Amino acid sequence: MIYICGECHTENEIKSRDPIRCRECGYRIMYKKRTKRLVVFDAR
Amino acid sequence: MIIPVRCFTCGKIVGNKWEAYLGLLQAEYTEGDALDALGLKRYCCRRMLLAHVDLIEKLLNYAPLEK
Amino acid sequence: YNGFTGRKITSQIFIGPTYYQRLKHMVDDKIHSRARGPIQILNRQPMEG
Amino acid sequence: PYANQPTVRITELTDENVKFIIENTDLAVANSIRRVFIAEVPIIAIDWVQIDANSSVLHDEFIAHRLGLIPLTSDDIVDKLQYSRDCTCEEFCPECSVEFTLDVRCNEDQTRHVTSRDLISNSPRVIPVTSDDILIVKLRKGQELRLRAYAKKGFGKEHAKWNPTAGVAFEYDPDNALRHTVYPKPEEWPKSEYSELDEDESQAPYDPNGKPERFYYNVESCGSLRPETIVLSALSGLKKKLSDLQTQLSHEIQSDV
Amino acid sequence: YARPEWMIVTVLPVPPLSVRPAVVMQGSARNQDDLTHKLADIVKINNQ
RNA sequence: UCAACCUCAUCUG
Ligand SMILES: CO[C@@H]1[C@H](O)[C@H](n2cnc3c(=O)nc(N)[nH]c32)O[C@H]1COP(=O)(O)OP(=O)(O)OP(=O)(O)O
Ligand SMILES: [Zn+2]
Ligand SMILES: [Zn+2]
Numbered sequence: 028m029i030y031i032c033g034e035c036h037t038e039n040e041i042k043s044r045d046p047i048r049c050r051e052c053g054y055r056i057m058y059k060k061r062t063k064r065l066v067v068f069d070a071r
Numbered sequence: 072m073i074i075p076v077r078c079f080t081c082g083k084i085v086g087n088k089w090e091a092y093l094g095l096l097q098a099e100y101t102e103g104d105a106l107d108a109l110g111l112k113r114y115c116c117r118r119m120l121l122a123h124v125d126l127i128e129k130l131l132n133y134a135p136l137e138k
Numbered sequence: 139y140n141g142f143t144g145r146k147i148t149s150q151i152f153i154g155p156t157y158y159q160r161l162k163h164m165v166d167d168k169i170h171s172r173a174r175g176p177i178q179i180l181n182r183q184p185m186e187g
Numbered sequence: 188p189y190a191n192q193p194t195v196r197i198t199e200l201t202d203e204n205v206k207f208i209i210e211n212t213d214l215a216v217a218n219s220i221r222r223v224f225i226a227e228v229p230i231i232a233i234d235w236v237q238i239d240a241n242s243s244v245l246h247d248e249f250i251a252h253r254l255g256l257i258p259l260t261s262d263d264i265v266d267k268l269q270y271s272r273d274c275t276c277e278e279f280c281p282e283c284s285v286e287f288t289l290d291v292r293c294n295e296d297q298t299r300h301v302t303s304r305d306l307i308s309n310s311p312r313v314i315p316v317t318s319d320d321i322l323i324v325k326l327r328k329g330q331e332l333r334l335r336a337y338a339k340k341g342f343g344k345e346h347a348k349w350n351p352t353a354g355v356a357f358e359y360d361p362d363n364a365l366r367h368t369v370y371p372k373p374e375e376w377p378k379s380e381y382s383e384l385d386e387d388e389s390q391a392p393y394d395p396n397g398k399p400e401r402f403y404y405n406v407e408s409c410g411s412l413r414p415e416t417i418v419l420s421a422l423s424g425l426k427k428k429l430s431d432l433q434t435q436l437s438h439e440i441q442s443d444v
Numbered sequence: 445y446a447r448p449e450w451m452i453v454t455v456l457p458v459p460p461l462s463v464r465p466a467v468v469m470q471g472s473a474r475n476q477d478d479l480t481h482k483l484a485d486i487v488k489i490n491n492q
Numbered sequence: 493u494c495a496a497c498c499u500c501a502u503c504u505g
């Protein structure tokens with residue numbers, strides 16, 4: 028999938044079985060990024 | 072965290088009055104006089120503005136996850 | 139004034155703004171029920187928790 | 188054996204408030220009219236939210252809650268709009284709902300106050316009572332809020348978001364003459380605004396044959412419905428409830444026969 | 445039912461595996477009960 | 493058609 032970097036906030040695409048290191052910053056904490064499917068919230 | 076829309080007890084909209092409350096406090100108005108100027112009459116509505124702690128400003132200091 | 143009938147409550151009632159706290163204990167975390175569920179290996183009796 | 192003929196005298200009428208007096212009426216009727224003010228007057232408010240992107244500090248359901256609480260002008264078309272359950276079409280359509288959109292991004296350095304003004308409605312008659320503004324969220328630079336919302340007809344019995352009124356002040360017997368409230372020390376008690384007593388007299392003399400009448404109302408509008416039309420719609424809705432009850436009662440009596 | 449000689453231990457009863465279950469983790473490993481380890485110690489000393 | 497045991501600490505009436 029596409030993981031957003033923890034520090035430089037740049038999306039990087041990491042394949043499976045690949046080390047979790049952002050290109051151009053090297054930070055080792057990525058975030059999965061919001062899903063395309065949309066969830067309905069009742070305003071209640 | 073942010074000023075609630077509508078007073079809990081009655082439901083009068085108090086969400087539009089926080090920025091005006093802060094501005095009137097900056098002017099010189101006492102908290103009670105500012106609350107009176109904003110039109111808050113019942114102590115239920117005055118509790119909303121008087122006791123509100125605006126943490127959204129502290130949370131906005133942290134950088135966003137996605138830029 | 140009584141909400142259901144509108145009649146004034148005879149005894150005047152103490153009302154005021156008091157600070158209340160919501161404790162972490164909530165019923166949704168505590169409700170539990172069991173019916174022929176999982177069973178321990180050693181005792182072969184219903185599990186714990 | 189028949190209903191009394193009530194009388195209304197409107198003392199104050201302002202865009203935010205209606206102060207009126209109903210005389211020659213029962214306490215039950217008056218209380219239930221107030222009750223219908225609060226809970227059974229239809230209004231328009233957001234009940235469906237779909238957030239495409241929310242990078243704000245507040246989570247998605249927090250934003251949805253605040254959006255639901257925002258009042259929406261419902262003066263005329265709330266009577267025209269149908270309930271979603273009644274509407275034949277699946278989900279929501281122009282007849283059963285009103286669509287709003289929010290697309291705000293804080294490109295500038297200064298904090299962007301997302302307000303109710305940023306909500307844009309597909310139908311001009313419903314607007315978020317903007318004509319300050321209700322603050323939905325504050326956006327730091329690089330934070331964005333995008334959402335689509337649908338607002339439906341409903342009354343406050345479902346959810347307090349559909350309350351058309353802020354505070355309904357109801358008072359009867361301003362000077363205690365029916366002794367419905369028995370003061371332990373009458374003198375310590377402040378006089379009512381509607382009180383006709385002299386300052387020396389704390390309470391009116393007990394009236395043994397009296398009945399609660401001459402009820403005083405102060406109905407404050409939330410801005411969605413005009414304060415006059417809140418009262419009119421409440422009376423009409425109570426009358427409609429009674430007529431539906433009578434129709435079902437007649438059908439069941441015929442069935443029993 | 446009970447002779448005094450029978451009190452002295454000449455034959456040690458080894459409880460069934462039901463008494464001493466093997467605690468399985470993820471299929472990767474099988475820990476053994478404390479009784480199994482103690483019986484292993486007893487068997488080692490007896491063989492020695 | 494379906495997941496470990498110990499241990500300790502923290503809370504609950
Ligand atoms: C009234 O007696 C009860 C019971 O005996 C049972 N109980 C509670 N703790 C224990 C415990 O440690 N061990 C055992 N065996 N039983 C226990 O709890 C007792 C009271 O305790 P409390 O005095 O705090 O009750 P408040 O007076 O405080 O009630 P508030 O106003 O908060 O509702
Ligand atoms: Zn990075
Ligand atoms: Zn209030």
Ligand SMILES: [Zn+2]
Pocket residue numbers: 274275276277278279280281282283284
């Ligand atoms: Zn429809």
